[PDB]
Amino acid sequence: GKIFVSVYNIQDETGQFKPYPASNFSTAVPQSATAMLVTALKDSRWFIPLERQGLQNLLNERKIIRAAQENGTVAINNRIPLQSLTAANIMVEGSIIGYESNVKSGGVGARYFGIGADTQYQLDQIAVNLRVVNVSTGEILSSVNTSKTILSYEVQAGVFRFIDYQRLLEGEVGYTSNEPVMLCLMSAIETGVIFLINDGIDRGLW
Amino acid sequence: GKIFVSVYNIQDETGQFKPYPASNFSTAVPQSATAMLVTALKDSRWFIPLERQGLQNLLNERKIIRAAQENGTVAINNRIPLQSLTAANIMVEGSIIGYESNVKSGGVGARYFGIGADTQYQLDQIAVNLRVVNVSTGEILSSVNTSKTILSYEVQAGVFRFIDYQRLLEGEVGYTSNEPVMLCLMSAIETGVIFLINDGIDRGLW
Amino acid sequence: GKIFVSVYNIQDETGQFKPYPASNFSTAVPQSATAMLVTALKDSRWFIPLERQGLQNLLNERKIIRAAQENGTVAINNRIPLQSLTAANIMVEGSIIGYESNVKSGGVGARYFGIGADTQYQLDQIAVNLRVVNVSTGEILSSVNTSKTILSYEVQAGVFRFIDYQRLLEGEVGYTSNEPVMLCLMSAIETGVIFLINDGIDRGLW
Amino acid sequence: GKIFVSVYNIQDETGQFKPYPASNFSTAVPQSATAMLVTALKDSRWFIPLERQGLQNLLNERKIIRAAQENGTVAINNRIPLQSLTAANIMVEGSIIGYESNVKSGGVGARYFGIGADTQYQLDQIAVNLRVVNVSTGEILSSVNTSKTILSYEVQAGVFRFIDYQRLLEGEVGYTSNEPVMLCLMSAIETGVIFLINDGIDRGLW
Amino acid sequence: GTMTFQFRNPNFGGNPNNGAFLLNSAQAQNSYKDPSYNDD
Amino acid sequence: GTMTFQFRNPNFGGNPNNGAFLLNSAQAQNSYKDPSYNDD
Amino acid sequence: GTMTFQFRNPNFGGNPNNGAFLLNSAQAQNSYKDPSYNDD
User: Fold this and answer.
1) Which letter does DSSP use for residue C2 in this model?
2) What residues in G contact F25, CB-CB < 8 Å?
């Protein structure tokens, strides 16, 4: 049997925004946890998430349903039987508790006569806290802080020497790969979910 | 038979804005999901969307209708029979859970004596989460995270050498193509909708 | 026996934001205390935290539970017995009372003919105040101000001399490590929690 | 016997923010008085502070306590006897009434052939006003304005001369120490608290 | 942080202040002489 | 404060105003003469 | 105000406009002559 879990809001409590050249309002971490976390809890075959984020939309839709068939005039084929809003035994709250930019930068670049090549790397770090709280009493059953590094590297190479008396050969090839902060945040949430499931296994619950 | 689906709001939870030179308030992802998603659900022949975004405008229009013909004085030709606000069996919530700028940049450029040519490319990545929730009980039936890369490339070439003793020939031809983030977001929503339909097929529903 | 502790809000009262090149809205200290502090109190085997941050989400979830099983029609297997919101004997309030940027900067760099190397370091300092208040009477039982330095260093080296008559060898290797302000804030909160536990031990309580 | 003191809010009335390169929203003085002041009153063995900053959190926690044990069903071991919110005889209000940047700057730097060295210093000044008001009648019993200078100095030295015909020796060593404005504000609050205690001693009270 | 690939050559890649160096550092290593003088 | 690793060479690392120095400070220490003149 | 330690040399410490001076003020004090000319 699966456990009903109600994820209400996984707030972006990192408070960080992206530096120049990015916008001043461009937050460094997606505001979209409670969608990555519901996906992580759904993907793990242990939990059935309940919406609870868009609960007001669900309540207005149920208002419309209950008002459309309250006269018994709707066709018995396309009527929707509302039972009740399914209740959750536990509740997974949490936050994105931090995003430190460039916890570890670095780079080596060499260049002999004309031809040269370099490499750079930057590690950001995103930390996500997840708390399984027991809805019956309110106490926090489990609380895990997970971290994940975000590696953004860049490898370049270039030639700017003379080939003949007056024939200049310039040229260069580069490549740059940033790990998407959304994928790293999803990985941190995934590891936190596995930790919560294993912890609930290791003490009584689940 | 088609399924009534009520799309309320597909929120732009990426939190990212466009970098310089673009405005600081210029969001990187359109705020116009719940219009691309209703179009995607309408185009797939499985669903009948209900408005639910502009539901207040629909309710005021129905107020005006019910107030215009409540006296029986409107002509029997141009009277509008209001039945009831059609109820939705499921509800497709979601978000644009992320937009990472330049997940993979790169470029190769060569230039011999005078004549040269280069190429650049940048891959942005947009991720969209879609959740079919069951309106009866409130549990999330399906949840899919879809991704889509946005390739913006630029190919240039240029000549700046001397043709004669003192005759300088400068010249250059370029081209630059950015995939519209609206079309890539629509493609991500489309793939997510196909995934939701196939998932509902693969387990009981639909 | 463990003590029920209710952490409501550990506010970011430092008021500082990050300097250029970072965004103007990018706060220097994470807004995510009350998640690091609940984790610190949970990790120390002395306390059972209660949520109290997201208490409204817990109250709406309990509303949904109490409304789902108030008719006795829910299955006796998946019904959730609500007892009462567990009460806390003490309450750990607090703040991040300060973040001074570069309390101590410095750096030594030497460079002989061509080859050179340098080092920089900067110490930020984050101070966190934690107050165990007695919920019965309201008086502050314990109040501790903890500090933690955040060392960000950078070591570089570079060669720019000529190897032959007209063969220029440029090259350089660098490294840069910033301590994540989230980890240093978590360490300050940890030391403050150990201080609070030892203080409660040293006078009557606990 | 100790005096119950209720510190409500020690507001940052300096109105100053930090200059470039710091953020525009980065206030020059921590917003965290009423936490440094409660710590200063607790450390001096004369006062018992009451929370009064987070009083709403305390009142909701007492609501939860009084609602958890109002049915007599809580275990007689883990029930919390609420007596009453302890009342304060006096009340220490105040403000951070000023922060002048660079009340006294200066610096001497010499540099002979190649080798040189310099020193800079800047004195900021923070002034804190503390007012012991009598809660019975409302009149201000004591009012003290304390000042504290914040010395930020920087000592550098550097060599940029030639050692041989064509061997250039560059090099330099620096150091920079800013007094943390949080520690200087805590020292100003400390001196103000000692002044208030001695003043209450010198006329009747305490 | 986000790393963006930027060309270093002012040709094909914009940054023009990087030119006077790239050339003066390529002439400072030009070991090729005129095929007229110092030759046959 | 946050320290970011930035290359000093205008090649591989952007900062172009750092070039005219790096070269003029490498020619001011160029003790290598032409293998034609002042040689065999 | 907050004082931050910044290197003055464009090598190891960024500020590149400080280079053309540091070198021209080190050549204006270069009292070392070529060990070939004005020597043995």
Assistant:
1) P
2) 11, 19, 23
Query: Could you give the residue ranges of the DSSP H alpha helices within chain C?
Result: 36-43, 55-68, 181-202
Q: Are B173 and B157 in contact (CB under 8 A)?
A: yes
How far apart are alpha carbons G22 and A140 in whole angstroms? 62
Q: Are A62 and B87 in contact (CB under 8 A)?
A: no
* Nearest CB to E12 within list B101, B106, B156: B156
Among A148, A204, A133, A137, residue whose Cα is nearest residue A179:
A148
Chains that touch F (3 or more CB pairs under 8 A): A, C, D, E, G
How many beta-carbon pairs below 8 A join chains A and E?
Answer: 55
**Which residues in chain C are immediately followed by a break of C to N over 2.5 Å?**
none
**Method in brief:** cryo-EM
B205/D140 Cα distance (integer angstroms) = 73
Kindly state the tokens that stand for A141: 């059953």
Compute the distance between CA of residue A88 and CA of residue D192 in angstroms, rounded to an integer.
Answer: 53
Domain span at residue D83 reads 1-206
- Residue E9 near chain B (CB below 8 Å): yes
Q: CB of A152 within 8 Å of any CB in chain E?
A: yes
Q: Could you write out the DSSP letters of every residue in chain B?
A: -PEEEE---EE-TT--B--TTS-TT-BSS-S-TTTHHHHHHHHSTTEEEE--SSHHHHHHHHHHHHHHSTTS-S-SSS----------SEEEEEEEEEEEEEEEEEEEEEE-SS-EEEEEEEEEEEEEEEEEEETTT-BEEEEEEEEEEEEEEEEEEEEEEEEETTEEEEEEEEEEEE--HHHHHHHHHHHHHHHHHHHHHHSS--
Is B111 close to E3, i.e. CB distance below 8 A? no
Give the helix/strand (H/E) hosting F4: none
Interchain contact, A165 vs E32, CB within 8 Å: yes
The upper half-sphere exposure of residue A182, i.e. CA atoms within 13 Å in the direction of its Cβ, equals 30
Q: Give the Cα separation of D48 and C140 in Å (integer).
A: 7
d(CA E36, CA D171) in angstroms, rounded, equals: 46
E35 upstream amide cis, omega within 30 of 0:
no
Whether D contacts C, i.e. 3 or more CB pairs less than 8 A apart, is yes
Contact between residue D33 and residue D126 where contact means Cβ atoms under 8 Å apart = no
CB contact under 8 A, F4 and A116: no
Q: How far apart are CA B166 and CA B159, in angstroms?
A: 16
Question: What residue type is B5 in one-letter code?
Answer: V
Interstrand relation of D47-50 and B3-6 (parallel, antiparallel or unpaired): unpaired
Contacts of E18 in chain F (CB under 8 A): 10, 14, 16, 19
The count of structural domains within chain D is: 1
* Closest Cα in chain C, distance from residue G21 (Å): 17
Residue in chain E nearest A123 by alpha carbon: E1
Taking CB atoms and an 8 Å limit, are E22 and A170 in contact across chains? yes
E33 CA to chain C: closest CA distance, Å? 13
Any F CB within 8 A of C112 CB: no
Residues 6+ apart with CB under 8 A from C160: C114, C168, C169, C170, C171, F9, F22, F25, F26
CA distance linking residue B25 with residue A23, whole number of Å? 8
CA distance C119 to C114: 17
Selection from A145, A134, A140, A142 nearest residue A14 by Cα: A145
In the structure encoding, which two tokens stand for residue B62, read together? 């129905």
Please provide the size of chain D in residues: 206
Q: The tokens of C170 are what?
A: 């440029």
